[PDB]
Amino acid sequence: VSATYSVVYETGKKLNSGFDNWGWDSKMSFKDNSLVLTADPDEYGAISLKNLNSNYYGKGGCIYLQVKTETEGLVKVQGVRGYDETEAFNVGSFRSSSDFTEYKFEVDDEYQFDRIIVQDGPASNIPIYMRYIIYSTGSCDDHILEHHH
Numbered sequence: 451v452s453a454t455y456s457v458v459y460e461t462g463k464k465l466n467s468g469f470d471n472w473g474w475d476s477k478m479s480f481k482d483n484s485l486v487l488t489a490d491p492d493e494y495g496a497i498s499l500k501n502l503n504s505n506y507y508g509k510g511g512c513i514y515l516q517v518k519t520e521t522e523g524l525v526k527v528q529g530v531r532g533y534d535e536t537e538a539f540n541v542g543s544f545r546s547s548s549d550f551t552e553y554k555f556e557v558d559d560e561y562q563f564d565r566i567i568v569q570d571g572p573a574s575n576i577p578i579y580m581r582y583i584i585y586s587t588g589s590c591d592d593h594i595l596e597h598h599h
Contacts, residue, residue: 455584462480469499470500473495474496495569499568512586517544518551519576524542527557538567
């Protein structure tokens with residue numbers, strides 16, 4: 451099968467149909483035409499974006515998103531088949547940027563997963579602004595947003 455995409459969030463004030471936030475120690479809000487993670491004061495807080503459309507996003511693949519923030523942190527997966535759902539696996543990091551920066555993270559082929567985690571490493575209580583959160587079953591080498599127009 452060719453690459454299949456799950457578009458979790460583009461812009462606006464809601465997640466797309468069939469996605470929910472199962473994160474912790476944080477508040478997810480919608481401001482500045484983005485999805486915003488603000489970890490609670492002094493907490494290693496996260497959003498965890500659960501796919502309710504299928505039992506999994508897929509096995510391996512690529513996670514793409516854009517981030518704008520003054521803090522930094524980690525992107526992970528959880529709900530991995532074969533594991534306790536609480537166990538999380540790091541797939542990449544994001545850093546501070548004045549405007550939206552694109553990231554692509556390869557998901558190990560060993561991981562068939564149902565949740566995308568974004569987490570504030572410094573426990574900073576600083577907003578992390580996100581757009582265009584998209585999962586592809588294909589490789590990151592084969593993904594580009596310009597082809598999503």
